[PDB]
Design a protein around this ligand. Structure first.
Ligand SMILES: COc1ccc2nc(C)c(O[C@@H]3C[C@H]4C(=O)N[C@]5(C(=O)NS(=O)(=O)C6(C)CC6)C[C@H]5/C=C\CCCCC[C@H](NC(=O)OCC5(C(F)(F)F)CC5)C(=O)N4C3)nc2c1
Ligand SMILES: [Zn+2]
Length: 199
């Protein structure tokens, strides 16, 4: 309406969780200054690698996971925002507030996880600190931590994957179930729900 109205920035990839070796570890690929500038321009010329990205807006940081050629994350992190890319902002390909789910085309250079068809309930949650947390699946969209810990340790990991023993994607971490600040269970978007959304 006004000549003063501002536009929200793009989501920016600022790092990744490295899962390629024997040791999981977080890597930062962009610092806060370049992140702020890239959010405004939407132009990110940095090379993207791997499956799990660390992403940030001006106000939040969380994770994003490539499965089947789509970079997925949570709506409560990304809203309807574009993601920065070498050629400018990229509009979401999937948006579903009812699932807390959004998706963009996976970045050039990323690797995608394969959707799990194992039917296994022994899962592993990957956090933004590269902790690999055993989680027993307890329903279509819930799992229990085998070793509970304060919600602090899970904050910022929405958008991260739950994996099966074979390293396939089983879901996208959405929310934590807490008792007196201790995370006992997690909610996630099952990969079948992503596979449906893709149709
Ligand atoms: C606006 O449009 C939408 C549409 C759909 C939608 N859907 C949601 C389920 C939702 O929930 C909110 C965000 C999420 C969260 O914090 N997500 C992280 C995370 O890390 N975020 S993040 O990266 O820090 C951040 C904020 C940058 C992006 C993984 C958590 C980690 C720690 C928990 C912190 C305390 C919070 C504990 C809380 N618990 C819970 O609500 O339980 C409910 C429930 C459940 F089953 F769990 F769903 C019925 C029992 C929780 O987890 N919330 C609250 N907001 C929305 C909003
Ligand atoms: Zn599997």
């Amino acid at each position: 309406h006004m000549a003063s109205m501002k536009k929200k920035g793009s989501v920016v990839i600022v790092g990744r969780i490295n899962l390629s070796g024997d040791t999981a570890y977080a890597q930062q690929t962009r610092g806060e200054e370049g992140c702020q500038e890239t959010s405004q321009t939407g132009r990110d010329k940095n090379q993207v690698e791997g499956e799990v990205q660390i992403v940030s807006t001006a106000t939040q940081t969380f994770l994003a996971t490539s499965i089947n050629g789509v970079l997925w994350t949570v709506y409560h992190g990304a809203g309807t925002r574009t993601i920065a890319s070498p050629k400018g902002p990229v509009t979401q390909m999937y948006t579903n507030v009812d699932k807390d789910l959004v998706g963009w085309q996976a970045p050039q250079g990323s690797r995608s996880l394969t959707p799990c068809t194992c039917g296994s309930s022994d899962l592993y949650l990957v956090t933004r600190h590269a902790d690999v947390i055993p989680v027993r699946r307890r329903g279509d969209s819930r799992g229990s931590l085998l070793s509970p810990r304060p919600i602090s340790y899970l904050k910022g990991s929405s958008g991260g994957p739950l994996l099966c023993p074979a390293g396939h994607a089983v879901g996208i971490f959405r929310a934590a179930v807490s008792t007196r600040g201790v995370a006992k269970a997690v909610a996630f978007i099952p990969v079948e729900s992503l596979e449906t959304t893709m149709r």
